[PDB]
């Protein structure tokens, strides 16, 4: 499923992402935009053999187990195939564990290069949240 800017913002809000650990909803929406273009089925193979899954592009090397990535730590204790659902619950809850480690949202390569240092508040503008 491909979400809409405001539709995603509300969905993330329904699962406690709004201001989670100090990270504004704008940042999360901006991250999803450049990471998967709001597509819950987005899957991208990286040069190191790992794959990023879902609307938040969660890596199979550290966070989820796709059964095809050697040395997978699976810190979110969940199969990567669960991150492709139309319901973003699993993805959102794994993201919560990710931003708690200590790298903040820098863990998201697209976010760090496209969102960081910009007015991410614009991403939730015009939304009926």
């Amino acid at each position, epitope marked *: 499923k491909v979400f809409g800017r405001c539709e995603l913002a509300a969905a993330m809000k329904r699962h406690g992402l709004d201001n989670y650990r100090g990270y504004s909803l704008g940042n999360w929406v901006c991250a999803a935009k450049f*990471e998967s273009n709001f597509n819950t089925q987005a899957t*991208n*193979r*990286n*040069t*190191d*053999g790992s794959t990023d899954y879902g609307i938040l592009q969660i890596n199979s090397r550290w966070w989820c187990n796709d059964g*095809r990535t050697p040395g997978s730590r699976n810190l979110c204790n969940i199969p990567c195939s669960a991150l492709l659902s139309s319901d973003i619950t699993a993805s959102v809850n794994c993201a919560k564990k990710i931003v708690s480690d200590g790298n903040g949202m820098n863990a998201w390569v*697209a976010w760090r*290069n496209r969102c960081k240092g910009t007015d991410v508040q614009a991403w939730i503008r015009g939304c009926r949240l």
Partner: nanobody, 119 residues
Framework: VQLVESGGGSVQAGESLRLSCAASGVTYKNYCIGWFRQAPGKDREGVVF????????YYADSVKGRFTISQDNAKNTVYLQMNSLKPEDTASYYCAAGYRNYGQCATRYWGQGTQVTVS
């Protein structure tokens, strides 16, 4: 971002082929662009990439010395020169772009793919 490939074909071992990837919009911060390959029955694997600073990194050790990557700014095109082709090189070749991530390229954009068959 748009990536369009061309140049695929069917050749005999020993010959050479050059693939091209015409790209638009790959000007964002810390981009990396390169080629992936997926042979029948195998997983899609990275081949070679170039980053925004001109650095080139190989991900498939078996292609080192045989495959070369080059970028032609004047034509916003990236090339993959494939020399001494072997039957094992048979595969679908994809142009891909992403973000630099400490030596790796986190891919987020893909071309349509082109087939290269080596007999």
């Amino acid at each position: 971002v748009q990536l369009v490939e061309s140049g695929g074909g069917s050749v005999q071992a020993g010959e050479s082929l050059r693939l091209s990837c015409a790209a638009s919009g790959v000007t964002y911060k810390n981009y990396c662009i390169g080629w992936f390959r997926q042979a029948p029955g195998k997983d899609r694997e990275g081949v070679v990439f170039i980053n925004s600073d001109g650095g080139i990194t190989y991900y498939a050790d078996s292609v080192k010395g045989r495959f070369t990557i080059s970028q032609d700014n004047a034509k916003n095109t990236v090339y993959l020169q494939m020399n001494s082709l072997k039957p094992e090189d048979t595969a679908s070749y994809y142009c891909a772009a992403g973000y630099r991530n400490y030596g790796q390229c986190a891919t987020r954009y893909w071309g349509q793919g082109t087939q290269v068959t080596v007999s």
